A paper describes a structure:
To study the structure function relationship of a new xylanase from the GH11 family the crystal structure of N. haematococca xylanase (NhGH11) was determined and refined to atomic resolution (1.0 Å). The overall 3D structure of NhGH11, consisting in total of 193 amino acids, is displayed in a single domain with β-jelly roll folding. Overall, the three-dimensional structure resembles a right hand with the fingers represented by two antiparallel β-sheets and a thumb loop located between strands β10 and β11. The inner antiparallel and highly twisted sheet creates a well-structured cylindrical cavity where xylan substrates bind and catalytic residues E89 and E180 are located. The catalytic residues E89 and E180 are located in the cleft with a side chain distance of ~ 10.5 Å. Inside the active site the carboxyl group of E89 (OE1) is hydrogen bonded to nitrogen (NE2) of Q139, hydrogen (HG3) of F137 and a water molecule (W49), while the second oxygen of the carboxyl group (OE2) is forming a hydrogen bond to Y80. The second catalytic residue E180 is forming hydrogen bonds to two water molecules via oxygen atoms OE1 and OE2 of carboxyl group, E180 strongly bends towards the main chain because the oxygen atom OE1 is forming a hydrogen bond with the main chain nitrogen of S75. The crystal structure refined with anisotropic B-factors to 1.0 Å resolution allowed to investigate hydrogen atom positions involved in main-chain interactions, side-chain interactions and even alternative conformations of amino acid side chains. A calculation of solvent accessibility shows that NhGH11 contains seven buried water molecules. NhGH11 is a mesophilic xylanase that can catalyze the efficient breakdown of xylan-based substrates at an optimum temperature of 45 °C and a pH of 6.0, and due to broad applications of its hydrolytic products NhGH11 can be considered for a wide range of corresponding industrial processes performed between 40 and 50 °C.
Numbering used by the authors: 5 to 193
Write the structure that this text describes.
Amino acid sequence: RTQSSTGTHGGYYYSFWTDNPNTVTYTNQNAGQFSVSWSGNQGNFVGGKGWNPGAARTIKYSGTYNPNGNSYLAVYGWTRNPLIEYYIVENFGTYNPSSGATAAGEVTVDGSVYDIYTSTRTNAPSIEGTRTFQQYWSVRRNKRSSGSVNTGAHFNAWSNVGLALGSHDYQILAVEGYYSSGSATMTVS
């Protein structure tokens, strides 16, 4: 029992995925706004709004993030040629989502140091099906729930660690939860 909802709403790309539709409700709202509520400490979900294709852009986000347990708030996206999955993690709960990734330095931008990591996913699900691909992570030290993200600064930092990002696929400001509860409303511009 899985559910994936993607498209364009309010003039923005949106994406919402869950493996337990009964414990999470995603609401597409006006312009770049979305809400999510999750409850029952059951299921994995990721959802939010942004762009497809992504770019080196400034992502402004404003809202309220009220998690309880394992959850994060991140700019999240993909490239192809090469296939890359990336995360700019602005806030997280009781689990650091980069756990197990390899430390790869620091970038200071938008009012915080971010710790950089890289990792490899082997024979794993992706936007292209089962693939082996690289991940990049920037994890914000100064956790926050509103601000602006200079994605180009991160992309540049990652390009000084390993292979560079490819041609952009989707790019969203996402809320994720894993067997937890919470709610959030975010507006992306």
